[PDB]
Amino acid sequence: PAEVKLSPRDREGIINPMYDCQPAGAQYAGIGIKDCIPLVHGGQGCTMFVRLLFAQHFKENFDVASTSLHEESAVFGGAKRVEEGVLVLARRYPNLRVIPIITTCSTEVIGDDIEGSIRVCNRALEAEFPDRKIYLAPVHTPSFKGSHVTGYAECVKSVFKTITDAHGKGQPSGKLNVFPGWVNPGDVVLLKRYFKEMDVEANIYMDTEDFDSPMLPNKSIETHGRTTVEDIADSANALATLSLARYEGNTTGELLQKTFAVPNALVNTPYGIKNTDDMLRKIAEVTGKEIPESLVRERGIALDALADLAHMFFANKKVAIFGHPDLVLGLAQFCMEVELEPVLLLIGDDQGNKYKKDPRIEELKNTAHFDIEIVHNADLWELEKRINAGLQLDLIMGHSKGRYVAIEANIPMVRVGFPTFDRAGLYRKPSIGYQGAMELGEMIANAMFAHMEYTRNKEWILNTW
Amino acid sequence: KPAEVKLSPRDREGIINPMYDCQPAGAQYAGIGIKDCIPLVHGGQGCTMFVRLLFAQHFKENFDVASTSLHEESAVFGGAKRVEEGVLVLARRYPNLRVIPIITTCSTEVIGDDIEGSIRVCNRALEAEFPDRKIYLAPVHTPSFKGSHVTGYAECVKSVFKTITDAHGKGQPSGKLNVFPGWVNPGDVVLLKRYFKEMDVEANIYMDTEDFDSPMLPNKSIETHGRTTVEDIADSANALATLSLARYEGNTTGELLQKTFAVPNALVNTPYGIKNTDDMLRKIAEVTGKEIPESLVRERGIALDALADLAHMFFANKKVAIFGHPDLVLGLAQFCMEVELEPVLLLIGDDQGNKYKKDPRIEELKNTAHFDIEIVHNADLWELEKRINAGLQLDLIMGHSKGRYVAIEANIPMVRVGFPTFDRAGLYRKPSIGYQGAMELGEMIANAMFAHMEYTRNKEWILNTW
Amino acid sequence: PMVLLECDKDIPERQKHIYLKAPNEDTREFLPIANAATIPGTLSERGCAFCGAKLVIGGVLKDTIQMIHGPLGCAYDTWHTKRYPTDNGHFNMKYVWSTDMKESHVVFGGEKRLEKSMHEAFDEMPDIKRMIVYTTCPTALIGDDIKAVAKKVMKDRPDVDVFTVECPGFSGVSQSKGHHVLNIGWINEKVETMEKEITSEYTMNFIGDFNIQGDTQLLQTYWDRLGIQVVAHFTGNGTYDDLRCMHQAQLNVVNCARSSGYIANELKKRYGIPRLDIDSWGFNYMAEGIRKICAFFGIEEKGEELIAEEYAKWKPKLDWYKERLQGKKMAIWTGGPRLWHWTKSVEDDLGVQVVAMSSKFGHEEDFEKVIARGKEGTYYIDDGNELEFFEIIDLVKPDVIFTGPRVGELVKKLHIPYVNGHGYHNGPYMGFEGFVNLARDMYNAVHNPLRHLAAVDIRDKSQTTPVIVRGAA
Ligand code: CLF
Ligand code: CLF
Ligand SMILES: [Mg+2]
Ligand SMILES: [Mg+2]
Ligand SMILES: [S]
């Protein structure tokens, strides 16, 4: 009677949304580009609340501007607000090179002609700044479909289309393109090390390592995306694209394959051991480079650590996971590797028709020995209501906006995905790869250990494990 | 009335809840960091087996240590034959064995076995039986009724270095630093190796325990070994300088190499916190003539950025108790004050108070603290529990896992530091020293406080927009 | 004079929004423009009208569903961002509700989607019988009539009460418009729709306090000591039904005249309840406020007992901080009122010099107040933007900035510490004890070893790493 079931939320309304709207994800894509300030065409909250969200996750400022739609534009249209906003950015930020122009619910409803405004601004900018090139990318992100996951993917794709349309195909680079998806600076640091150890040249899109910026003696601000116009333009010239996230950048890898014949390889997001193994095998396949001994060792260190935990503390423990779909599906596989039982997976948006075709669902259906409920179009009330109805969980894995569910239910909780504002430093700690699997497993154990102490549940057992 | 930093002894003769183990345990720890070494603990069997268990608790790994298996007969009539047989049984069964620290215990110190005489007997016997091997037998005098595992670690390092360098002497200058980090984790070794690599400084780290965190490999090979070789130890006579990070955990070996071989020894504050790391790097630059790299300015800046998110918001005016090895207690007290924590109670666990009173870091604390600090020497962990019972208000404890029940029952968040940290996972892989270590310590403190705020419903809504 | 900053050379209209107060000026000739349109593309700090209604005022209530009629982003964005505790387990911070508007609702209308969401919310939490419904950008644009839906829901479900607010984010110029729409609808529709027991000879409402880190609960210890019944708090630690009773009060005490003056003005017009403006931040300000309240009620001696005890408890600590904060330079970059509630109170009580102030959404009224209380040589900025903030820092070199966390994280790179001027560091900040809390955070922010450490370049042979000696009150 062994069943992995997909079902939608049974309510029309949302209580406690899992994700933000599309424009928020588009902003996140854009802030990873060097010399980029996204321009969010709509009311002011659509910008300011997202700048706050990024400050909650990263404890850093990121620059995003608004077009400040007001009442007159709601009656007569807002094109003049886009056009002014572009010029005001260009005039006041002399080094600015890229402006994704991100629509919102308001500006999608009223039908402002973004591409027409871009033609006006391109003419104005070419006349006023003859020796400057600014790339204006139209990003259509109505908030009444999809989520910040879809908006991220749409913005990446539009920026890549815009910049590669301008520069076309040149000389082969010998590099990989890599789209890790929506990951932390620590995940980017880990991937750079993997490619360096395997002697593989690669651009990671976007390179967000420097979001964790120093406080320096010279008072310099280094909190920038490192992916440049040049880096994005060179994507046309790659040997191949490695796409780690079906819902977070694969569509850009496909676009580069259609436009420039750069072959795209979509792999399972590298959460856990097998998914990391298979990612490295694909890298080896496409580059002809061997997997280095250093990665065999990191893998073995991870396995050694996880083996201290799995049958002692994890076996038969019931887990709920929520977050981005690539993360939820990848973490469910990781959980199984360490004998955890992910019985409830919650995915937070209207993309169920795609999720039903995800091959990882089938990988779960063919492996799990316990029922799995996958709730799509889920909110976080879907988790709280199921706990209130009697679902027994030993662990929750998810982002910080679910914290009160775990706190009130007295269930230990590991913070994963976005945003993780209610713990310190998690943006620096990998979750993907071998090291990431080890770090995740040790977070899980340490959360369980503290819970055993606070609840006096065999707390004496933490001596000779 | 100005703040006072007061040193006081435990007021009881007995111990309740000892902070440290005995000298032989620390000597065993020193020895397991040497490649092709199996320490031989001359005494009853518990003196070995309980310490192998202790290392398994901290590291979740096996380490090889042997016993001489003192029994009744040898306790009454002398244990030399047990030493001598144990050495030969080791050599016969472990063909790659090169170093045997012969570690005394309370029993074999009380009965007065002549360890140096047994070593002469064994050298004779080994030279005849194995004419193509050289095995280094180091006499390690570690009566457990003096000192602690801290002093026993320092004594074993010094005796092994004396033994090996006596045999090899001084030769070709190596151009390397000797580095004695003291009793630290594998993650601390990993950080130091990176610092030296980024500063283009060749160095031997004594002992190199990185590989204690060993992989589970496809070929089933066992790589859980110390990496410091005989050759590494012998080369200490040829170094440009010694950098000693721990006054109580290896500086006496630096001093012996200075006296014997004219290798200048530089003792610095143990590098817990920002200033102590800065000053260690300044000393390395002075002795080597090498610049501090930009990469370390950046790591320092990332640490400061992280700690600035925590200090005035969550840490200011919070009261801390710290216990552990003396170099770690004094260094963590300095780190705490950099981040606005107030370390009001420092507990150091052995009879070395005559040395602690002269520690320059005590004066550094006297000159900075704006709050009273009690430094209890010869402390046990009952000295902490009793003070809490009498009304000491603490917001945080920093110490090793054998103090866990104090924190649990008092409902005080604790961060696990020092040795052993068996009741949390992976801590041996985390640095505590250096810039990255300061950041990871500060974030452990914050995350422990954050969980405590949730469990106790103490303004748990505040963890949103800090 | 009015100031044209270098970063505003291509947006020179900004000069009429920035006043540098100079000796002998007639300030009436130099009042910033305020509450005017934003310039696109500036990185203004402003938010939207919906924020002002739901996040700032309505969402404070402890027992009310906050139904945001729109796509899910507006709801997500106003959840896990405020610090207004309650005495019922923080219901207000744990939950947010959306109608999850989809494309089909843009095409065909969202009224049935709202109605369904509303009944679901009441069904999921059967103990909750009160709701506020808010419009957002697209539900305003398609003309959904949320008042009509709410009317039907109340007819169909007679044990619930629903209030509605039209507050799409493009309305007005800032969050200010949301305040106004909410205030006026509440007094028009819901005041005097129930009554409560009167248990004191002395009654008041406290208008314009949102219980940031428990501010309202701290002030309530004063009212309870003085034997004053608070009919309603607008809206800190409040309830929907208490707000229906506001007409019963003898006196309206106002702190936030910006967000909440509207309903105090209408309560005076309609019910004759006098409006008393106070400052509930500031040590000596709090004493003035208590004395006014007690003079109005004729309980002066009870006021003087409370003041005496509070000064005995807290004044020595306040004065310890004043000794160490005297002469420090401060900037305040917040919504508006805290500029005029803090500039002179930190000067009087802590010796702190406020050298620059920026208001996101203040009106000309707020500028009148702040310039009346503020210093010469200080910059007064309406609707400041990020590049202006950098130029102002170079001009006035503050020792500390009271602002939101994101800006605090930006100025940290320049080694300038911050205190959260919105949600506080370690509050509450109102009242006698609260000003001591504010002073403690300011002290720990500025006299912080990490700031000194950050300035040291370890590569400079010439530099050492210092130690600083701190203190505690
Ligand atoms: S000013 Fe809402 S965040 Fe926007 S794109 Fe629409 S779902 Fe997303 Fe104010 S009312 Fe809200 S927050 Fe903006 S939309 Fe307007
Ligand atoms: S075989 Fe057993 S455990 Fe060994 S001593 Fe003897 S009774 Fe005790 Fe004690 S103090 Fe340390 S551990 Fe030894 S060297 Fe003495
Ligand atoms: Mg291991
Ligand atoms: Mg930072
Ligand atoms: S605003």
mmCIF file with all atom_site columns, C-alpha atoms and ligand atoms in Angstrom, chain A residues 20-21 23 43-46 49 104-106 143, chain C residues 48 50 71-74 77 136-138 167-170, ligand 1:
data_model
loop_
_atom_site.group_PDB
_atom_site.id
_atom_site.type_symbol
_atom_site.label_atom_id
_atom_site.label_alt_id
_atom_site.label_comp_id
_atom_site.label_asym_id
_atom_site.label_entity_id
_atom_site.label_seq_id
_atom_site.pdbx_PDB_ins_code
_atom_site.Cartn_x
_atom_site.Cartn_y
_atom_site.Cartn_z
_atom_site.occupancy
_atom_site.B_iso_or_equiv
_atom_site.pdbx_formal_charge
_atom_site.auth_seq_id
_atom_site.auth_comp_id
_atom_site.auth_asym_id
_atom_site.auth_atom_id
_atom_site.pdbx_PDB_model_num
ATOM   1  C  CA  . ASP A 1 20  ? 6.875  35.792 -2.627  1.00 0.00 ? 20  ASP A CA  1
ATOM   2  C  CA  . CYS A 1 21  ? 5.551  36.933 -6.037  1.00 0.00 ? 21  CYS A CA  1
ATOM   3  C  CA  . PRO A 1 23  ? 8.844  40.399 -9.239  1.00 0.00 ? 23  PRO A CA  1
ATOM   4  C  CA  . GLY A 1 43  ? 3.965  50.792 -6.752  1.00 0.00 ? 43  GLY A CA  1
ATOM   5  C  CA  . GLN A 1 44  ? 6.707  51.483 -4.225  1.00 0.00 ? 44  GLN A CA  1
ATOM   6  C  CA  . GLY A 1 45  ? 6.010  48.551 -1.891  1.00 0.00 ? 45  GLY A CA  1
ATOM   7  C  CA  . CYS A 1 46  ? 6.901  46.111 -4.693  1.00 0.00 ? 46  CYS A CA  1
ATOM   8  C  CA  . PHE A 1 49  ? 9.472  45.196 0.821   1.00 0.00 ? 49  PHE A CA  1
ATOM   9  C  CA  . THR A 1 104 ? 4.372  44.048 -11.411 1.00 0.00 ? 104 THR A CA  1
ATOM   10 C  CA  . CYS A 1 105 ? 0.690  43.199 -11.034 1.00 0.00 ? 105 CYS A CA  1
ATOM   11 C  CA  . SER A 1 106 ? -0.228 46.891 -11.540 1.00 0.00 ? 106 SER A CA  1
ATOM   12 C  CA  . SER A 1 143 ? 2.327  38.447 -9.715  1.00 0.00 ? 143 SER A CA  1
ATOM   13 C  CA  . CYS C 2 48  ? 3.027  52.125 -0.443  1.00 0.00 ? 48  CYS C CA  1
ATOM   14 C  CA  . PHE C 2 50  ? -1.325 49.408 1.541   1.00 0.00 ? 50  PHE C CA  1
ATOM   15 C  CA  . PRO C 2 71  ? -1.907 38.380 -5.358  1.00 0.00 ? 71  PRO C CA  1
ATOM   16 C  CA  . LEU C 2 72  ? 0.165  36.676 -2.698  1.00 0.00 ? 72  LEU C CA  1
ATOM   17 C  CA  . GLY C 2 73  ? 3.204  39.010 -2.741  1.00 0.00 ? 73  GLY C CA  1
ATOM   18 C  CA  . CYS C 2 74  ? 1.553  41.837 -0.813  1.00 0.00 ? 74  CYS C CA  1
ATOM   19 C  CA  . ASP C 2 77  ? 5.851  41.055 2.104   1.00 0.00 ? 77  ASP C CA  1
ATOM   20 C  CA  . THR C 2 136 ? -4.009 46.109 -3.302  1.00 0.00 ? 136 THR C CA  1
ATOM   21 C  CA  . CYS C 2 137 ? -2.876 47.449 -6.709  1.00 0.00 ? 137 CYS C CA  1
ATOM   22 C  CA  . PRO C 2 138 ? -4.685 45.007 -9.021  1.00 0.00 ? 138 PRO C CA  1
ATOM   23 C  CA  . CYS C 2 167 ? -5.506 51.192 -0.257  1.00 0.00 ? 167 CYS C CA  1
ATOM   24 C  CA  . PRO C 2 168 ? -3.875 50.155 -3.508  1.00 0.00 ? 168 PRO C CA  1
ATOM   25 C  CA  . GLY C 2 169 ? -0.161 50.903 -3.483  1.00 0.00 ? 169 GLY C CA  1
ATOM   26 C  CA  . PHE C 2 170 ? -0.398 53.529 -6.256  1.00 0.00 ? 170 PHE C CA  1
HETATM 27 S  S1  . CLF D 3 .   ? 2.718  48.703 -4.271  1.00 0.00 ? 1   CLF D S1  1
HETATM 28 FE FE1 . CLF D 3 .   ? 2.027  42.921 -4.297  1.00 0.00 ? 1   CLF D FE1 1
HETATM 29 S  S2  . CLF D 3 .   ? 4.305  42.860 -4.018  1.00 0.00 ? 1   CLF D S2  1
HETATM 30 FE FE2 . CLF D 3 .   ? 3.753  44.122 -5.849  1.00 0.00 ? 1   CLF D FE2 1
HETATM 31 S  S3  . CLF D 3 .   ? 3.903  42.752 -7.649  1.00 0.00 ? 1   CLF D S3  1
HETATM 32 FE FE3 . CLF D 3 .   ? 1.759  43.066 -6.803  1.00 0.00 ? 1   CLF D FE3 1
HETATM 33 S  S4  . CLF D 3 .   ? 1.575  41.031 -5.523  1.00 0.00 ? 1   CLF D S4  1
HETATM 34 FE FE4 . CLF D 3 .   ? 3.859  41.436 -5.768  1.00 0.00 ? 1   CLF D FE4 1
HETATM 35 FE FE5 . CLF D 3 .   ? 1.948  47.852 -2.230  1.00 0.00 ? 1   CLF D FE5 1
HETATM 36 S  S5  . CLF D 3 .   ? -0.227 47.172 -2.769  1.00 0.00 ? 1   CLF D S5  1
HETATM 37 FE FE6 . CLF D 3 .   ? 1.183  45.387 -3.057  1.00 0.00 ? 1   CLF D FE6 1
HETATM 38 S  S6  . CLF D 3 .   ? 3.171  45.908 -2.058  1.00 0.00 ? 1   CLF D S6  1
HETATM 39 FE FE7 . CLF D 3 .   ? 3.245  46.464 -4.297  1.00 0.00 ? 1   CLF D FE7 1
HETATM 40 S  S7  . CLF D 3 .   ? 1.542  45.052 -5.433  1.00 0.00 ? 1   CLF D S7  1
HETATM 41 FE FE8 . CLF D 3 .   ? 0.927  47.313 -4.774  1.00 0.00 ? 1   CLF D FE8 1
#
